[PDB]
């Protein structure tokens, strides 16, 4: 408490009904919720939102406050998870964002793996659209000087209308104390998304995010596959020092594997920019 009141963002906590937790092992810090009157022109209208709360140290408060203020600054875009409001007065700190109903893109793809017996849910144009939308979101974040630093399919959320929304672009990443052997409770090894300059030299640019986007492209066109399959972290270190790159996935046209390999060029200036990736993927989508 004793946080400043920002009337542009403050939302009455009694207009929230907190619901079931999100994430896997977060001690009830992020929950689904219903909000009433998030649109002040429809004060009684319900909507589904997501709420993040503390618990907590003085540092924990400052981290969330900083994460909140980052979202305030970055502004709104169709392909990111947008801040909707905050509860800072007369109670616990809440940060309210959009709820993307279908969950993260990795789980979305894996659950959709294949008269229409030969037709799985996911067609090539819709896979390209997913990649294009993420590229557009990332191009927006870069224009606002935001480096994501862990861009991955697990950090892209999918709305009821299959819109991609980049999540956690404003989360603290503790880049100076990453356990490179860390395996998440879902079995993910996040070191597998890190650009070499980040992993080896602790340098991040927008071009490091471009590297991770290449890994994300590979996840899309393997319908949520795990990158560097079967390669433990110790071997990944030596393979990246030798310049190893992932193989072309099955059922993946050369245009897309081409984009992947460009995103993994050693020199960051020889990777495409997000603006170039948007245009390249746009051409593929228009090719139908
Ligand atoms: C300990 C690890 C952990 O916490 N892991 C986790 C992973 C995903 C989600 N998650 N999942 C969805 C989803 O499926 N649809 N829509 C969402 N907004 C979703 C969110 C979500 O909610 C938020 C509310 C406020 C802020 C500031 C950020 C978020 C995020 C990212 C929550 C927790």
Cα–Cα dist 6/73, whole Å = 13
Instruction: With H, G, I as helix, E, B as strand and everything else as coil, classify residue 97.
Output: strand
User: In angstroms, rounded to a whole number, what is the distance separating the alpha carbons of residues 169 and 156?
Assistant: 10
Ligand 1 midpoint to CA 75 (Å):
18
Sequence ranges of the chain with CATH classification 1.10.510.10: 100-286
Technique that determined the structure: X-ray
Give the residue range(s) of CATH 3.30.200.20 domains in the chain: 1-99
Residue ID of nearest Cα to ligand 1 atom 15: 100
Give SS3 for 282. helix
Closest to 224 in 3D by CA, of 182, 188, 254: 188
Which residue carries 């004793």 as its tokens?
2
Decide whether any atom of ligand 1 lies within 6 Å of the 50 Cβ.
yes
**Cβ 100 under 6 angstroms from ligand 1:** yes
Structure tokens at 128: 């390209």
**After which residues does the chain break, using C–N > 2.5 Å?**
55, 114
Give distance in angstroms: CA of 30 to centre of ligand 1: 6
Q: 161 catalytic, yes or no? A: no
Which residue's CA is the nearest one to ligand 1's atom 22? 50
Q: Say how far residue 125 (Cα) sits from the centre of its chain.
A: 21
Span 1-99 CATH architecture: 2-Layer Sandwich (3.30)
CATH number of 100-286: 1.10.510.10
Q: How far is Cα 45 from Cα 32, in angstroms, rounded to an integer?
A: 17
* 23 C-alpha to ligand 1 centroid (Å): 6
Closest Cα to atom 13 of ligand 1: 103
Question: Which structure tokens are listed for 107?
Answer: 């789980």
Are the C-beta atoms of 166 and 134 separated by less than 8 Å?
yes
Give the integer Cα–Cα distance in Å for 65 and 40: 24
Angle at CA 184, nearest 5°, toward 96 and 79?
40
Is there a binding annotation on residue 30?
yes
Could you tell me if the CB of 84 is within 6 A of ligand 1? no
Q: What is the DSSP string of 117-164?
A: TT--S--HHHHHHHHHHHHHHHHHHHHTT---S---GGGEEE-TT--E
Is there an atom of ligand 1 within 6 Å of 26 CB?
yes
Active site residue: 2, 150, 168, 282, which one?
A: 150
> Contact 34/19 with Cβ under 8 angstroms?
yes
Ligand 1 centre to CA of 22 (Å) is: 6
């Amino acid at each position: 408490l004793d946080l400043p009141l920002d009337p542009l963002w403050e939302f009455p906590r009694d207009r929230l009904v907190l619901g079931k937790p999100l994430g896997e092992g977060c001690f009830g810090q992020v929950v689904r919720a219903e909000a009433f009157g998030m649109d002040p022109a429809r004060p009684d209208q319900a909507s589904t939102v997501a709420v993040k709360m503390l618990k907590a140290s003085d540092k924990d408060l400052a981290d969330l406050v900083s994460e909140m203020e980052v979202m305030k600054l970055i502004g709104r875009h169709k392909n990111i998870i947008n801040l909707l409001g905050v509860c800072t007065q007369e109670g616990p700190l809440y940060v309210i964002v959009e709820c993307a109903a279908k969950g993260n893109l990795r789980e979305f793809l894996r659950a959709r793996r294949p008269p229409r017996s030969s037709e799985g849910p996911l067609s090539f144009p819709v896979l390209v659209s997913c990649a294009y939308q993420v590229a557009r979101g990332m191009q927006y974040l870069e224009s606002r000087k935001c480096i994501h630093r862990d861009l991955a399919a697990r950090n892209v959320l999918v709305t009821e209308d299959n819109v991609m929304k980049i999540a956690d672009f404003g989360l603290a990443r503790g880049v100076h104390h990453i356990d490179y052997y860390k395996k998440t409770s879902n079995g993910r090894l996040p070191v597998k998304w890190m650009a070499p300059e980040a992993l080896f030299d602790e340098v991040y640019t927008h071009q490091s995010d471009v590297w991770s986007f290449g890994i994300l492209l590979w996840e899309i066109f393997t319908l949520g596959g795990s990158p560097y399959p079967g390669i433990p972290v110790e071997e990944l270190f030596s393979l990246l020092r030798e310049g190893h790159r992932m193989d072309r996935p099955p059922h993946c046209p050369p245009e897309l594997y081409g984009l992947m390999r460009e995103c993994w060029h050693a020199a960051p200036s020889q990777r495409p920019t997000f603006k170039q990736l948007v245009e390249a993927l746009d051409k593929v989508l228009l090719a139908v």
